[PDB]
Ligand binder design. Structure first.
Ligand SMILES: Nc1nc2c(ncn2[C@@H]2O[C@H](COP(=O)(O)OP(=O)(O)NP(=O)(O)O)[C@@H](O)[C@H]2O)c(=O)[nH]1
Ligand SMILES: [Mg+2]
Lengths: 78, 166
């Protein structure tokens, strides 16, 4: 199996394949939004264990020390 | 309200994700992005009665086959999807049914045999062969196109009707 990250969203979850942990959280967010929402409302990612705080999208997956995140509309909460 | 856990299974590339997204979002996915696993929840009206569909879109890639056990245990109805231009995907249907049996102790679960990509002119799985397979299982056969939307609601809504009529 490949490595992958679990993204919990408003209407379900998505498992997002990653080649390595040097992928940025921005890349993961973009993949999750494109799959789940299609083609403007903005989104953040949150660590599963830290509600209401946006992860730095320019940081790497490795830096998060987490493999589960919530995808949250910026005008909303998880 | 009442929620139905429906699971879409079948070989890689047969159109499981395209079927799911055409149902949920009324949009055809042209790209082939292999699934690991994804769920989608949507409120729908079926025969005048509102319910919540919880659709689990699964991997056709055999490297994720270990995942089947978890989702086959809790899945409440299954779309067993092959592509009408892929005889191997038709051969593969039985494996999914057998695995659903090892965890449910029976195949006594709502299931629909789905022949997808029926918009394509070139067919290598005969309609009578798919009809006969479905008959051998005692389940409906529905031809679908995720691209045109043909048969998509029928396929998913048939599972909900079968659950409601248990
Ligand atoms: N013409 C046509 N193409 C389809 C249909 N359904 C899916 N496809 C195409 O077939 C390719 C694979 O579809 P996809 O939904 O990703 O298949 P899948 O079963 O989810 N693959 P995986 O098991 O890897 O997740 C895509 O390019 C998609 O556009 C259909 O009904 N008609
Ligand atoms: Mg898929």
């Amino acid at each position: 199996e490949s490595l992958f990250v679990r993204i919990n969203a408003a209407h379900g979850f998505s498992l997002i394949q990653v080649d390595n942990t040097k992928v940025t959280m921005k890349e993961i967010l973009l993949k999750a939004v494109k799959r789940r929402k299609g083609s403007g409302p903005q989104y953040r990612l949150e660590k599963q264990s830290e509600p209401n705080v946006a992860v730095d999208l320019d940081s790497t997956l490795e830096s998060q020390s987490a493999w589960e995140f919530c995808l949250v509309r910026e005008n909303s909460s998880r | 309200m009442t929620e139905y856990k429906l699971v879409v299974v079948g070989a890689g590339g047969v159109g499981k994700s395209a079927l799911t997204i055409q149902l949920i979002q009324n949009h055809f996915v042209d790209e082939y992005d292999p699934t690991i696993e994804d769920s989608y929840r949507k409120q729908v009206v079926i025969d005048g009665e509102t319910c919540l569909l919880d659709i689990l879109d699964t991997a056709g890639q055999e490297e994720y086959s270990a995942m089947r056990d978890q989702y086959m245990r809790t899945g409440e109805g299954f779309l067993c999807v092959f592509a009408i231009n892929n005889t191997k995907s038709f051969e593969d249907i039985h494996q999914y049914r057998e695995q659903i049996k090892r965890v449910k102790d029976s195949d006594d679960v709502p299931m629909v045999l789905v022949g997808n990509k029926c918009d394509l002119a070139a067919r290598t799985v005969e309609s009578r062969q798919a009809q006969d397979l479905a008959r051998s299982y005692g389940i409906p056969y529905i031809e679908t196109s995720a691209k045109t939307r043909q048969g998509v609601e029928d396929a998913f809504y048939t599972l909900v009707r079968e659950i409601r009529q248990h």
